[PDB]
């Protein structure tokens, strides 16, 4: 339902979250941005009423009452996030019991599988946050999508075990060579600073982009916004991509 | 499904009669205890013809065309074997694909849910064999049973973290919390040789208990049988098994 | 290429070659402390004795003794592990050969490596001797999920793939091409009952080697008989069944 | 780069491209912590109608896209470099896909072998960046000759082996035996400094040199460059190499 | 000794008239600890051919070269299959009149015992075995160490030599005439006609053989056949016919 081939915009406030919609965005992430924790409703509340695309924001890690409390504050969608302070080491929130559909992040198919069964409804691949370095994203979509291709063509007597070694459920795996993908959409996120990152996580095999609040520190965000939005949807119209790269 | 049980290995017609007479619910078709791979189909048919009970037979592990014969044989249990050679180290049989149902090992709760994912309709809960050694029975034993309490009564939200520790499909244990017990019939082995032997397994828990070829070099097989076939019935009756134990 | 399907069998004589060739072998491997080529007498009785393809193994290494081989006429040559190595580090160099090489591998990359020296057939296979199949399963899984995940992995990966398992990536580009090995690939190694050379088919073998096991049976033209219909009628369990009471 | 005995030098402009061009330059290389990426497209083309000779340029190593945006640019040769921040620590770019060519890094025989099997159509023999120190390009361009030279006199029978060795592809192996040397351009770089340094990189078996922005630093850029350049092409003569390091 | 040759262990008149009969270049005297055999014993032999003899003595044991030097032996061998009576110092063959053979492992040890004066060269592993792996081994080191010093650049010599333990001058000498100064001979193993032939192809200038000769049924023949191959080690044909009596 997530749209496939889009891109997903961090935004503070309305004005931002109003420039995200226009340029395309297929959601926004609202946000506030020591301990990191799950933003003021009141800055959610806000963005909810700016955009009639979907909001996402987000909650730390198990913190099953931050999402309870976003669920009631109407958001479209929970992300469990590894960027904020986690609030449980051990154990992630238990995504089925809720009504709003979550997104969490995965660094190989394991976790992946793991936070599938927890609930998880989307995925966002992603490496360390903040650097504006791409290579996080490229490592674990790499990693991730080879490991799928793996499931999908292998023995199926064989999966069992491959379940046992990568930590992941077999019902989950045998669901993925089934389909020949993942059951949910996949986002690539960590780093995508320039249109030709972007465009790269497509070619890797995502099914589309979250961006940070780079866009915003740019001296033109809807221009820098749009041309991501771009990138991501044609990103194998290399002339475009270059035309787009030129103004940044 | 066939509790409270004693399941009993016969060489030939005349040992799987006295066997069925003792009372066994099911009989172990073998050759012998180098390479040891399954038996002879003329010496499983023997034991197929001399008994109405049902007769089970031995496959090495992975050995998915030695499980194909049996079934072709109309064989009533395939039991892929630890105790025979294995032919594959990695790979147990997808028992999915098969009409016959399986029995398979374990030693813990782990193997337990990984044989169930692969088709196994029941477990056969076994340490090191021929020893005439309980205590490789009652470990496993006991910490298969111990596993399961632990994950009946845990909170929901941490059986997919217990799942990834274990190295078990996480709705294996999800059923396994909602039954309160194996989904499945698991009985005892490794070393059961007095009748207290028999009833300390049911004592912990086991579903019932196979017995090797030992009963059939004593003096008096059928009455050794029988002891331990009303052993493993009447676990709580402690006098009688006290008066089943003074013959042999 | 070989009758995919086939079995090979070790033979030490006209005797043994006429009856392996009576069974439906599709070809025969003759054999005769340090373990060299046999005496070419031996291997022309049994070149003489038989009209399918006759084999015959040389030392790893051991160029000369193949082109012994390859004067005497032989049809394929085993470059072999069973035999005591020549060389611990070089194999011959098979496409200098006008015969065809069978050698051994225990992962793709070997396999791939044999390939690129020019072997025209490979044996994936464990120890020897042991009449224990795992020694074949173990490597059959091996390079048949390791072809599956090159037959299937993003085109860009291969070269850091064939790093990685020492394979010279011209080869795993072909394998990616083909959708498989470009040279047939027997199991060897352990191969005793019916039920573990039809096994060996199931697992994504081409055929079977089958040892001198057979002869030292009661009935070697029956046992014979036995592993080579199993071998064809893999998927027929009944069959397989029947072949395996006597 | 076409051009064995050539010189290579970074430009972050129309004015730099000018001068390396006028020194004798065989192709300019266009540029413009924190994460180095691809250059803005418009400083790339400022430098391509700026001069005649080639442009290089670039791209993380991995960066497929950023690749392709420069072939769309019309540069004439794609650099897939280690100074800039990888973007993938596994898989270079598949450049047999492009139509531009595509130089690439090495320390050794395997990772050249290895880049040419991914399609490379240039060489750059480099160690450490940013340095002015040669013992860099001095230790790889020994290594890899070194190797070359062994693979051309060794034993043919021994060859895939010594791939399995080196982690190189044998075919690769194969035809560098087959003619004597690498079957591209190698050139070398890292630290390359002094007219003495480029003639060096050159007596030790380069086919060329690349030389960064320390050029453009010093009081004469112009005459330095083409001291460089003179150095690199006549490099077995001293008299003329002592002459030109006097300025 | 000549290239191409055969060298063949005697213990006695009898066989040292054979080997000389079946065409061995040269032959090599031989009678817990191994020393220098009983001059008696050499002096049988040398009185029996007219083909060079010689002997092998203990490493070290610079006496009892000197004795077979007084002797009137052709060749002396510092051998490793006797006991050695130096573990750190080899004799210093240069203050001798009659040249010596050496055994070596790789260009190193060639080198050394080069400038320790030695005449000529035998490339060897371990003894006694039949396995021809410990000759292969070695002959492939030493000639794919001499191939790289043929062709490296001048200047890398003296880092060269001191990773190799090699003196420079004999690596510099080496460089000169794209081969080592002296004659090398592979040994160890070499059992089957195929097998010195073997060595030939590897670029050995020619082989010793043991005693194992003299324990096959007809000494001669088979002397005679190793012979053969060895001076016609690229006429398969014929090597393959030389290897049936066997
Ligand atoms: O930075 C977020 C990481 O994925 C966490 O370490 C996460 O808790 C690990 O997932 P799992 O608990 O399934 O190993
Ligand atoms: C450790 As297992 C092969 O029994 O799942
Ligand atoms: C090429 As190999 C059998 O030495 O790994
Ligand atoms: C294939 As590489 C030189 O990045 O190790
Ligand atoms: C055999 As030595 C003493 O030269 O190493």
Redesign the pocket.
């Given at each position: 339902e997530m749209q496939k081939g889009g891109v997903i915009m961090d935004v503070v406030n309305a004005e931002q979250a109003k420039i995200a919609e226009a340029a395309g965005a297929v959601a926004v992430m609202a946000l506030e941005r020591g301990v990191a924790r799950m933003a003021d409703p009141t800055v959610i509340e806000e963005v909810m009423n700016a955009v009639s695309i979907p909001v996402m924001a987000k909650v730390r890690?198990?913190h099953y009452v931050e999402a309870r409390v976003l669920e009631a504050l109407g958001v479209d969608y929970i992300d469990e996030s590894?960027?904020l302070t986690?609030a449980?080491?051990?154990?992630?929130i238990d995504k089925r019991q809720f009504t709003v559909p979550f997104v969490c992040?995965?660094?190989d198919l394991?976790?992946a599988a793991?936070?599938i069964a927890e609930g998880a409804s989307m995925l966002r691949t992603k490496g360390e946050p903040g650097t504006g370095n791409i290579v996080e994203a490229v490592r674990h979509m790499r990693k991730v999508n080879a490991q799928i291709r793996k499931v999908v063509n292998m023995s199926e007597d064989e999966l069992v075990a491959e379940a046992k070694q990568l930590?992941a459920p077999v019902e989950v795996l045998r669901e993925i060579k089934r389909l020949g993908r993942l059951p949910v959409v996949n986002f690539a996120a960590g780093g995508v600073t320039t249109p030709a990152d972007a465009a790269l996580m497509m070619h890797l095999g995502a099914d589309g982009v979250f961006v940070g609040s780079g866009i915003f520190k740019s001296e033109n965000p809807e221009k820098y916004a749009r041309a991501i939005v771009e990138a991501t949807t044609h990103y194998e119209d290399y002339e475009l991509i270059a035309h787009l790269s030129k103004g940044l």
């Amino acid at each position: 339902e997530m749209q496939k081939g889009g891109v997903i915009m961090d935004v503070v406030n309305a004005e931002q979250a109003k420039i995200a919609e226009a340029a395309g965005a297929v959601a926004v992430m609202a946000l506030e941005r020591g301990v990191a924790r799950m933003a003021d409703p009141t800055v959610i509340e806000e963005v909810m009423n700016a955009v009639s695309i979907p909001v996402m924001a987000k909650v730390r890690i198990g913190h099953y009452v931050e999402a309870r409390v976003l669920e009631a504050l109407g958001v479209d969608y929970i992300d469990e996030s590894e960027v904020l302070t986690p609030a449980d080491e051990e154990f992630h929130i238990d995504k089925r019991q809720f009504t709003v559909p979550f997104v969490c992040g995965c660094r190989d198919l394991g976790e992946a599988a793991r936070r599938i069964a927890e609930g998880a409804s989307m995925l966002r691949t992603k490496g360390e946050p903040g650097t504006g370095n791409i290579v996080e994203a490229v490592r674990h979509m790499r990693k991730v999508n080879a490991q799928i291709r793996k499931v999908v063509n292998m023995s199926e007597d064989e999966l069992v075990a491959e379940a046992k070694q990568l930590g992941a459920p077999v019902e989950v795996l045998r669901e993925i060579k089934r389909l020949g993908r993942l059951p949910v959409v996949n986002f690539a996120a960590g780093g995508v600073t320039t249109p030709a990152d972007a465009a790269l996580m497509m070619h890797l095999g995502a099914d589309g982009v979250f961006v940070g609040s780079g866009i915003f520190k740019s001296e033109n965000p809807e221009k820098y916004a749009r041309a991501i939005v771009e990138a991501t949807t044609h990103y194998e119209d290399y002339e475009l991509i270059a035309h787009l790269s030129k103004g940044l």
